[PDB]
Amino acid sequence: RPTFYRQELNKTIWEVPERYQNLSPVGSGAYGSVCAAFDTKTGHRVAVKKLSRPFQSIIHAKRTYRELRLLKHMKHENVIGLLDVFTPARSLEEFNDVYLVTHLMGADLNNIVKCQKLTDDHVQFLIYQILRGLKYIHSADIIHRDLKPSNLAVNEDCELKILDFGLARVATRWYRAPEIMLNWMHYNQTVDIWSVGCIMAELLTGRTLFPGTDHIDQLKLILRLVGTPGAELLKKISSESARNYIQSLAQMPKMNFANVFIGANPLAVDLLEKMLVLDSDKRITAAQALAHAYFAQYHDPDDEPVADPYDQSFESRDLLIDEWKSLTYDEVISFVPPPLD
Ligand SMILES: COc1ccccc1Nc1cc2cnn(-c3cc(C(=O)NC4COC4)sc3C)c2cc1F
Ligand SMILES: CCCCCCCCO[C@@H]1O[C@H](CO)[C@@H](O)[C@H](O)[C@H]1O
Ligand SMILES: CCCCCCCCO[C@@H]1O[C@H](CO)[C@@H](O)[C@H](O)[C@H]1O
């Protein structure tokens, strides 16, 4: 067992192994707080996330378990991965703190579009990396469901990694697929493609595509561009109210994407039209998108790997906080780090 040391950072008390020095706060989310640290064993800076109140309720416990099991499975350059997992606890009784260690990125994508003026080559590389990691995640039968700029970390090298939760230290609805905002509850993997399409449009133009003020304003904005849904889509909406509002709006023709995104790479416009499709059955998948001519300079089919199947069966079980905690402890003690290069 390594030597731990205790220091306080932003009303928060941190107990981390000796090998991580110079703890420096980066930001905070709702489920944890992130610090920068120097890894003496590798000579590289890293990010340490202390989970906030990990076992304070049934929801928190399952969430803690969920993040550990998921991040332990993700082994892909464009998806955040685990370099280390530790807890000062010496036993399961004495277990109540969880720390996760990953690579250290430079910022999130909304801290970059805030500068704006992103070149077209920059959009090809950034979106290609998202899709490439999206393909890996989707091959594991995982849906992100919350893709947004704050969940995309980037380096000054322009390398990108999909986070599970970003820093709140950019409304989520602006990037939500319309079916989620309708509460379909049977979401397709392509709900993430819609979000990617919303993010791409923002990178190319410098403005939020659908800056809706609420969930109802959000759908009116989506309809103004993609157009009122056809009869084939309407018959699939069971909600009379939802169907009533959609049809109640004065019909709006689909806008010419070429004009809305005039000045953009015509190959990018073509991709946006394939992602921003109302029917989720007709949206281009992540794997299909990587083969679009827009990513010709980066597409390498022998270097776009898939993931081993992920067991998500625990998601349905209703367990006690103590059982969620012991399972989390089991995952902590069993973690095997990836080998240093
Ligand atoms: C270990 O944390 C986590 C562990 C597991 C899952 C999620 C997380 N979360 C999480 C992970 C990273 C990894 N890099 N960044 C980061 C650093 C930024 C920054 O300002 N760096 C300075 C420039 O040199 C210091 S911006 C930004 C998005 C992160 C933010 C996170 F919320
Ligand atoms: C690295 C891959 C991240 C997987 C996405 C999990 C993190 C964001 O997704 C989480 O769980 C659900 C996922 O369907 C979302 O609906 C929730 O909003 C969020 O808490
Ligand atoms: C106000 C804009 C109307 C939104 C129409 C959303 C159509 C989404 O598409 C639908 O996704 C469903 C799952 O979510 C699938 O079950 C359907 O097969 C698919 O057509």
Short mmCIF file of C-alpha atoms and ligand atoms in Angstrom, two decimals:
data_model
loop_
_atom_site.label_atom_id
_atom_site.label_comp_id
_atom_site.label_asym_id
_atom_site.label_seq_id
_atom_site.Cartn_x
_atom_site.Cartn_y
_atom_site.Cartn_z
CA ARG A 1 0.00 0.00 0.00
CA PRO A 2 1.46 3.34 -1.09
CA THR A 3 1.98 6.31 1.21
CA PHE A 4 -0.95 8.74 1.15
CA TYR A 5 -0.88 12.41 2.10
CA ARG A 6 -3.67 14.82 3.00
CA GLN A 7 -4.22 18.38 1.79
CA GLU A 8 -7.22 20.69 1.42
CA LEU A 9 -8.25 22.26 -1.90
CA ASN A 10 -11.41 24.38 -2.20
CA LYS A 11 -13.11 23.28 1.02
CA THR A 12 -12.36 19.73 -0.16
CA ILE A 13 -9.96 17.37 1.61
CA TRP A 14 -7.78 15.23 -0.68
CA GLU A 15 -5.91 12.02 0.23
CA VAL A 16 -3.83 10.91 -2.76
CA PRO A 17 -0.78 8.65 -3.11
CA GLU A 18 2.68 10.19 -2.85
CA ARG A 19 3.40 9.64 -6.55
CA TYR A 20 0.95 12.43 -7.47
CA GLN A 21 2.42 15.83 -6.60
CA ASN A 22 1.48 19.48 -7.08
CA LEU A 23 -2.28 19.05 -6.90
CA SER A 24 -3.89 22.00 -8.68
CA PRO A 25 -7.68 22.44 -9.00
CA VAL A 26 -9.00 22.49 -12.57
CA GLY A 27 -12.76 22.59 -12.09
CA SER A 28 -15.79 20.79 -10.73
CA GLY A 29 -18.87 18.93 -11.84
CA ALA A 30 -21.94 17.78 -9.95
CA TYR A 31 -20.55 14.27 -9.32
CA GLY A 32 -16.87 15.03 -8.69
CA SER A 33 -14.01 17.51 -8.63
CA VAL A 34 -10.94 17.44 -10.88
CA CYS A 35 -7.35 18.42 -10.11
CA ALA A 36 -4.10 18.56 -12.04
CA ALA A 37 -1.21 16.51 -10.67
CA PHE A 38 2.33 15.55 -11.62
CA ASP A 39 2.86 11.78 -11.89
CA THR A 40 6.34 11.15 -10.51
CA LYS A 41 6.35 7.59 -11.88
CA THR A 42 5.85 8.63 -15.53
CA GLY A 43 7.00 12.26 -15.53
CA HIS A 44 3.72 13.38 -17.10
CA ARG A 45 0.91 15.57 -15.80
CA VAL A 46 -2.40 13.82 -15.12
CA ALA A 47 -5.94 14.61 -13.97
CA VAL A 48 -7.33 13.28 -10.68
CA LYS A 49 -11.10 13.22 -10.11
CA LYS A 50 -12.38 12.83 -6.55
CA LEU A 51 -15.94 11.53 -6.63
CA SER A 52 -18.26 13.73 -4.56
CA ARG A 53 -20.36 11.88 -1.97
CA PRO A 54 -19.84 8.57 -3.81
CA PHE A 55 -21.95 6.42 -1.46
CA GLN A 56 -24.47 8.89 -0.01
CA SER A 57 -27.57 7.21 -1.49
CA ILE A 58 -28.71 4.34 -3.69
CA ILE A 59 -28.41 6.58 -6.75
CA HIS A 60 -24.93 7.83 -5.85
CA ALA A 61 -23.70 4.30 -5.15
CA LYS A 62 -24.96 2.85 -8.43
CA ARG A 63 -23.59 5.91 -10.23
CA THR A 64 -20.17 5.39 -8.63
CA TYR A 65 -20.24 1.72 -9.65
CA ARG A 66 -21.42 2.70 -13.14
CA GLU A 67 -18.53 5.10 -13.74
CA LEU A 68 -15.89 2.70 -12.42
CA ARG A 69 -17.13 -0.28 -14.45
CA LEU A 70 -17.50 1.83 -17.60
CA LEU A 71 -14.18 3.69 -17.40
CA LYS A 72 -12.39 0.41 -16.62
CA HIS A 73 -13.73 -0.94 -19.93
CA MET A 74 -12.91 2.04 -22.18
CA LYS A 75 -9.54 1.50 -23.92
CA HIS A 76 -9.53 3.86 -26.90
CA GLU A 77 -7.52 6.94 -27.82
CA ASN A 78 -10.64 9.08 -28.34
CA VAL A 79 -12.38 7.96 -25.11
CA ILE A 80 -11.29 8.92 -21.60
CA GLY A 81 -9.46 6.01 -20.00
CA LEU A 82 -8.31 5.01 -16.53
CA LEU A 83 -4.63 5.34 -15.67
CA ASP A 84 -5.17 4.60 -11.97
CA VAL A 85 -7.86 3.98 -9.36
CA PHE A 86 -7.18 4.38 -5.65
CA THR A 87 -8.86 4.95 -2.30
CA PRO A 88 -7.20 5.78 1.04
CA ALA A 89 -9.45 3.11 2.57
CA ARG A 90 -7.62 0.07 3.94
CA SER A 91 -10.78 -2.07 4.08
CA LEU A 92 -14.37 -2.25 2.86
CA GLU A 93 -15.64 -1.01 6.22
CA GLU A 94 -13.33 2.01 5.93
CA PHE A 95 -14.28 2.67 2.27
CA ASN A 96 -15.94 5.96 1.32
CA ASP A 97 -13.65 7.79 -1.12
CA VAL A 98 -12.99 7.04 -4.79
CA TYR A 99 -10.37 8.74 -6.97
CA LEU A 100 -9.95 8.28 -10.73
CA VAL A 101 -6.81 9.18 -12.68
CA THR A 102 -6.78 9.91 -16.42
CA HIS A 103 -4.74 11.85 -18.94
CA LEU A 104 -4.65 15.63 -18.56
CA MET A 105 -6.32 17.54 -21.39
CA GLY A 106 -6.06 21.25 -22.16
CA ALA A 107 -9.68 22.42 -22.23
CA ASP A 108 -13.18 21.48 -23.37
CA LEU A 109 -14.67 22.26 -26.76
CA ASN A 110 -16.77 25.24 -25.63
CA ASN A 111 -13.55 26.87 -24.38
CA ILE A 112 -12.40 26.61 -28.03
CA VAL A 113 -15.44 27.67 -30.04
CA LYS A 114 -15.44 30.66 -27.68
CA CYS A 115 -12.41 31.66 -29.76
CA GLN A 116 -14.23 30.70 -32.98
CA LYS A 117 -12.75 30.95 -36.49
CA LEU A 118 -12.03 27.22 -36.66
CA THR A 119 -10.47 26.22 -39.97
CA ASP A 120 -12.14 23.54 -42.07
CA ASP A 121 -9.21 21.18 -41.51
CA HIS A 122 -9.72 21.69 -37.77
CA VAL A 123 -13.36 20.60 -38.10
CA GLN A 124 -12.45 17.48 -40.09
CA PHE A 125 -9.96 16.35 -37.45
CA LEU A 126 -12.10 17.17 -34.41
CA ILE A 127 -15.31 15.61 -35.74
CA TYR A 128 -13.42 12.59 -37.08
CA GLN A 129 -12.02 11.93 -33.61
CA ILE A 130 -15.48 12.20 -32.03
CA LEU A 131 -17.01 9.77 -34.53
CA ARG A 132 -14.01 7.44 -34.18
CA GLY A 133 -14.51 7.22 -30.42
CA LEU A 134 -18.28 7.19 -30.89
CA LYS A 135 -17.95 4.12 -33.11
CA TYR A 136 -15.98 2.38 -30.35
CA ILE A 137 -18.52 3.31 -27.67
CA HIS A 138 -21.49 2.26 -29.80
CA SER A 139 -19.87 -1.09 -30.65
CA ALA A 140 -20.03 -1.80 -26.90
CA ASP A 141 -23.81 -1.20 -26.94
CA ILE A 142 -23.33 2.05 -25.00
CA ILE A 143 -25.27 5.24 -25.75
CA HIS A 144 -23.76 8.48 -24.46
CA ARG A 145 -27.06 10.36 -24.65
CA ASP A 146 -25.49 13.59 -23.39
CA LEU A 147 -22.83 14.53 -25.96
CA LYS A 148 -22.10 18.25 -25.71
CA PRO A 149 -19.05 20.55 -25.97
CA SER A 150 -18.27 20.31 -22.24
CA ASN A 151 -17.93 16.50 -22.57
CA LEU A 152 -15.21 16.80 -25.25
CA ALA A 153 -11.69 17.41 -23.93
CA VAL A 154 -8.99 18.65 -26.31
CA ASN A 155 -5.24 19.28 -26.27
CA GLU A 156 -3.26 22.03 -27.95
CA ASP A 157 -2.18 19.16 -30.20
CA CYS A 158 -5.89 19.07 -31.18
CA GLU A 159 -6.34 15.58 -29.75
CA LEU A 160 -9.84 14.87 -28.47
CA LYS A 161 -11.28 12.50 -25.86
CA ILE A 162 -14.95 11.91 -25.09
CA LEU A 163 -15.70 12.40 -21.40
CA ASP A 164 -18.59 10.82 -19.54
CA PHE A 165 -19.13 14.00 -17.50
CA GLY A 166 -17.54 17.36 -18.25
CA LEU A 167 -16.73 20.37 -16.11
CA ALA A 168 -19.40 22.85 -15.04
CA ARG A 169 -16.67 24.95 -13.38
CA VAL A 170 -23.82 25.55 -22.80
CA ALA A 171 -27.28 24.14 -22.13
CA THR A 172 -27.59 20.39 -22.60
CA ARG A 173 -30.88 20.64 -24.52
CA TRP A 174 -29.27 22.54 -27.41
CA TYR A 175 -27.64 19.27 -28.53
CA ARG A 176 -30.37 16.75 -27.65
CA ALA A 177 -31.93 14.58 -30.33
CA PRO A 178 -35.63 15.50 -30.74
CA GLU A 179 -36.80 12.03 -29.66
CA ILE A 180 -35.15 12.42 -26.25
CA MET A 181 -36.89 15.77 -25.75
CA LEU A 182 -40.14 14.01 -26.71
CA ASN A 183 -39.46 11.28 -24.12
CA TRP A 184 -39.52 8.37 -26.56
CA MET A 185 -37.66 6.15 -24.03
CA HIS A 186 -36.54 3.81 -26.87
CA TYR A 187 -33.54 5.78 -28.07
CA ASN A 188 -31.29 4.64 -30.90
CA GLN A 189 -27.51 4.92 -30.85
CA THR A 190 -27.94 7.70 -33.43
CA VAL A 191 -29.14 10.08 -30.70
CA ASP A 192 -25.40 10.71 -30.35
CA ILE A 193 -25.06 11.36 -34.09
CA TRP A 194 -27.63 14.16 -33.84
CA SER A 195 -25.60 15.74 -31.04
CA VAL A 196 -22.43 15.44 -33.13
CA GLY A 197 -24.26 17.13 -36.00
CA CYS A 198 -25.22 19.99 -33.69
CA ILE A 199 -21.61 20.31 -32.53
CA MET A 200 -20.23 20.23 -36.08
CA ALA A 201 -22.55 23.04 -37.18
CA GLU A 202 -21.32 25.13 -34.24
CA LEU A 203 -17.64 24.59 -35.09
CA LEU A 204 -18.16 25.61 -38.73
CA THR A 205 -20.27 28.73 -38.13
CA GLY A 206 -19.46 29.88 -34.60
CA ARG A 207 -23.08 29.95 -33.42
CA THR A 208 -25.22 27.42 -31.59
CA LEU A 209 -27.37 25.66 -34.18
CA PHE A 210 -30.52 25.39 -32.02
CA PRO A 211 -30.22 27.81 -29.06
CA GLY A 212 -33.69 27.00 -27.77
CA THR A 213 -34.86 28.63 -24.55
CA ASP A 214 -36.76 25.52 -23.41
CA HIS A 215 -37.82 22.09 -24.63
CA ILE A 216 -40.76 23.48 -26.62
CA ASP A 217 -38.79 26.36 -28.12
CA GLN A 218 -36.09 23.78 -28.88
CA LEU A 219 -38.38 21.75 -31.14
CA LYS A 220 -39.68 24.80 -33.02
CA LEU A 221 -36.07 25.66 -33.83
CA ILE A 222 -35.32 22.12 -35.03
CA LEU A 223 -38.41 22.16 -37.26
CA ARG A 224 -37.50 25.49 -38.87
CA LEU A 225 -34.39 23.86 -40.37
CA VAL A 226 -35.20 20.19 -40.96
CA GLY A 227 -38.85 20.96 -41.76
CA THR A 228 -42.10 19.59 -40.43
CA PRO A 229 -41.99 15.78 -40.09
CA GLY A 230 -43.71 13.79 -42.80
CA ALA A 231 -46.70 11.51 -42.45
CA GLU A 232 -44.45 8.47 -42.01
CA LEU A 233 -42.92 10.01 -38.87
CA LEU A 234 -46.16 11.41 -37.45
CA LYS A 235 -47.84 7.99 -37.27
CA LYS A 236 -45.07 6.85 -34.90
CA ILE A 237 -45.74 9.54 -32.25
CA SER A 238 -48.26 8.17 -29.76
CA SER A 239 -48.48 11.33 -27.65
CA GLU A 240 -51.54 13.30 -28.73
CA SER A 241 -50.18 16.45 -27.06
CA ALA A 242 -46.75 16.12 -28.70
CA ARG A 243 -48.46 15.30 -32.00
CA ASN A 244 -50.85 18.20 -31.36
CA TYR A 245 -48.09 20.77 -30.86
CA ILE A 246 -45.95 19.57 -33.78
CA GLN A 247 -48.89 19.67 -36.19
CA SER A 248 -50.22 22.86 -34.57
CA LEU A 249 -47.20 24.85 -35.74
CA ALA A 250 -47.67 26.38 -39.17
CA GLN A 251 -46.00 24.01 -41.60
CA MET A 252 -42.42 24.98 -42.44
CA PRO A 253 -40.53 23.66 -45.49
CA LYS A 254 -37.12 22.09 -45.02
CA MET A 255 -34.44 24.75 -45.36
CA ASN A 256 -31.74 24.47 -48.02
CA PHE A 257 -28.79 23.38 -45.90
CA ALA A 258 -26.46 24.80 -48.56
CA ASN A 259 -27.74 28.30 -47.77
CA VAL A 260 -27.82 27.89 -43.98
CA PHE A 261 -24.16 26.78 -44.07
CA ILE A 262 -23.06 28.80 -47.12
CA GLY A 263 -19.30 29.24 -47.18
CA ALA A 264 -18.72 25.84 -45.57
CA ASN A 265 -17.04 22.89 -47.25
CA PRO A 266 -19.72 21.31 -49.48
CA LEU A 267 -18.55 17.94 -48.17
CA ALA A 268 -19.24 19.15 -44.63
CA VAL A 269 -22.71 20.38 -45.63
CA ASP A 270 -23.44 16.93 -47.05
CA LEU A 271 -22.42 15.28 -43.77
CA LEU A 272 -24.53 17.67 -41.68
CA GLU A 273 -27.54 16.78 -43.82
CA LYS A 274 -26.95 13.09 -43.03
CA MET A 275 -26.67 13.67 -39.26
CA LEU A 276 -29.48 16.21 -38.77
CA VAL A 277 -32.25 13.86 -39.91
CA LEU A 278 -35.48 13.75 -37.91
CA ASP A 279 -35.97 10.00 -38.43
CA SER A 280 -33.36 8.31 -36.24
CA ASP A 281 -33.57 5.21 -38.45
CA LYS A 282 -32.24 7.30 -41.36
CA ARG A 283 -29.40 9.03 -39.50
CA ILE A 284 -25.89 8.09 -40.59
CA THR A 285 -24.21 5.86 -38.04
CA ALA A 286 -20.80 6.64 -36.58
CA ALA A 287 -19.15 3.90 -38.66
CA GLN A 288 -20.85 5.13 -41.83
CA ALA A 289 -19.80 8.71 -41.05
CA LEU A 290 -16.11 7.79 -40.82
CA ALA A 291 -16.35 6.62 -44.45
CA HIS A 292 -17.79 9.92 -45.66
CA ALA A 293 -15.54 11.62 -48.21
CA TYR A 294 -15.33 14.56 -45.79
CA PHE A 295 -12.83 12.60 -43.65
CA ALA A 296 -10.75 11.40 -46.62
CA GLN A 297 -7.50 12.78 -45.19
CA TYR A 298 -7.95 10.90 -41.89
CA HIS A 299 -10.11 7.83 -42.61
CA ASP A 300 -8.24 4.57 -41.97
CA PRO A 301 -10.61 1.58 -41.74
CA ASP A 302 -7.91 -0.70 -40.31
CA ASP A 303 -7.36 1.82 -37.47
CA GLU A 304 -10.94 2.44 -36.28
CA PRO A 305 -11.29 -0.35 -33.72
CA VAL A 306 -14.41 -1.64 -31.99
CA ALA A 307 -14.80 -2.56 -28.32
CA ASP A 308 -15.28 -5.81 -26.45
CA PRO A 309 -18.91 -6.38 -25.41
CA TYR A 310 -19.87 -4.49 -22.26
CA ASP A 311 -21.99 -6.18 -19.58
CA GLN A 312 -24.63 -3.60 -18.64
CA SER A 313 -26.88 -6.08 -16.81
CA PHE A 314 -26.24 -4.40 -13.44
CA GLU A 315 -28.20 -1.38 -14.70
CA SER A 316 -31.52 -3.14 -13.99
CA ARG A 317 -30.75 -4.49 -10.50
CA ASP A 318 -32.11 -2.67 -7.45
CA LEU A 319 -29.52 -3.21 -4.72
CA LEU A 320 -28.75 -1.77 -1.31
CA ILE A 321 -26.15 0.96 -0.87
CA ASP A 322 -23.90 -1.52 0.93
CA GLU A 323 -24.00 -3.95 -2.01
CA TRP A 324 -23.31 -1.19 -4.53
CA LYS A 325 -20.40 -0.13 -2.30
CA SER A 326 -18.88 -3.61 -1.98
CA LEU A 327 -19.11 -4.12 -5.74
CA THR A 328 -17.39 -0.77 -6.25
CA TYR A 329 -14.70 -1.82 -3.76
CA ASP A 330 -14.30 -5.08 -5.70
CA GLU A 331 -13.71 -3.06 -8.87
CA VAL A 332 -11.20 -0.80 -7.12
CA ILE A 333 -9.05 -3.61 -5.73
CA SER A 334 -9.10 -5.52 -9.03
CA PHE A 335 -8.02 -2.61 -11.26
CA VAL A 336 -4.94 -3.33 -13.37
CA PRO A 337 -3.33 -0.18 -14.80
CA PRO A 338 -2.25 -0.04 -18.44
CA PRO A 339 1.49 -0.48 -18.96
CA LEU A 340 3.64 2.63 -19.24
CA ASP A 341 4.89 3.17 -22.79
C1 LIG B 1 -9.85 12.83 -13.92
O1 LIG B 1 -11.13 13.37 -14.16
C2 LIG B 1 -12.05 12.46 -14.73
C3 LIG B 1 -11.90 11.09 -14.51
C4 LIG B 1 -12.81 10.18 -15.08
C5 LIG B 1 -13.86 10.66 -15.86
C6 LIG B 1 -14.01 12.03 -16.07
C7 LIG B 1 -13.11 12.94 -15.52
N1 LIG B 1 -13.29 14.38 -15.75
C8 LIG B 1 -12.29 15.22 -16.45
C9 LIG B 1 -11.28 14.66 -16.95
C10 LIG B 1 -10.29 15.48 -17.64
C11 LIG B 1 -9.14 15.05 -18.24
N2 LIG B 1 -8.56 16.44 -18.77
N3 LIG B 1 -9.66 17.32 -18.29
C12 LIG B 1 -9.61 18.78 -18.52
C13 LIG B 1 -8.48 19.58 -18.06
C14 LIG B 1 -8.66 20.98 -18.41
C15 LIG B 1 -7.63 22.07 -18.06
O2 LIG B 1 -7.97 23.19 -17.87
N4 LIG B 1 -6.22 21.67 -17.95
C16 LIG B 1 -5.09 22.73 -17.58
C17 LIG B 1 -4.36 23.05 -18.71
O3 LIG B 1 -3.11 22.21 -18.04
C18 LIG B 1 -4.14 22.15 -16.75
S1 LIG B 1 -10.14 21.16 -19.23
C19 LIG B 1 -10.57 19.55 -19.17
C20 LIG B 1 -11.88 19.00 -19.76
C21 LIG B 1 -10.50 16.77 -17.71
C22 LIG B 1 -11.77 17.27 -17.06
C23 LIG B 1 -12.56 16.39 -16.48
F1 LIG B 1 -13.72 16.82 -15.88
C1 LIG B 2 -17.16 7.28 -22.15
C2 LIG B 2 -18.60 6.97 -22.56
C3 LIG B 2 -19.57 7.73 -21.66
C4 LIG B 2 -20.89 6.97 -21.57
C5 LIG B 2 -22.02 7.96 -21.30
C6 LIG B 2 -22.31 8.00 -19.81
C7 LIG B 2 -22.10 9.42 -19.28
C8 LIG B 2 -23.27 10.30 -19.71
O1 LIG B 2 -24.47 9.59 -19.65
C9 LIG B 2 -24.94 9.33 -18.35
O2 LIG B 2 -25.81 8.24 -18.30
C10 LIG B 2 -26.81 8.28 -19.28
C11 LIG B 2 -26.27 7.63 -20.55
O3 LIG B 2 -27.31 7.11 -21.33
C12 LIG B 2 -27.22 9.72 -19.60
O4 LIG B 2 -28.51 9.74 -20.12
C13 LIG B 2 -27.13 10.58 -18.34
O5 LIG B 2 -27.58 11.87 -18.64
C14 LIG B 2 -25.68 10.58 -17.85
O6 LIG B 2 -25.73 10.58 -16.45
C1 LIG B 3 -40.70 17.82 -33.28
C2 LIG B 3 -39.78 16.97 -34.15
C3 LIG B 3 -40.34 15.56 -34.28
C4 LIG B 3 -39.25 14.57 -33.86
C5 LIG B 3 -39.40 13.25 -34.61
C6 LIG B 3 -38.41 12.25 -34.03
C7 LIG B 3 -38.29 11.01 -34.91
C8 LIG B 3 -37.20 10.11 -34.32
O1 LIG B 3 -37.11 8.91 -35.04
C9 LIG B 3 -37.69 7.82 -34.38
O2 LIG B 3 -36.91 7.48 -33.27
C10 LIG B 3 -37.58 6.52 -32.51
C11 LIG B 3 -36.81 6.24 -31.22
O3 LIG B 3 -36.56 7.43 -30.54
C12 LIG B 3 -37.70 5.21 -33.29
O4 LIG B 3 -38.40 4.27 -32.53
C13 LIG B 3 -38.41 5.45 -34.62
O5 LIG B 3 -38.31 4.30 -35.40
C14 LIG B 3 -37.76 6.62 -35.33
O6 LIG B 3 -38.52 6.97 -36.45
#
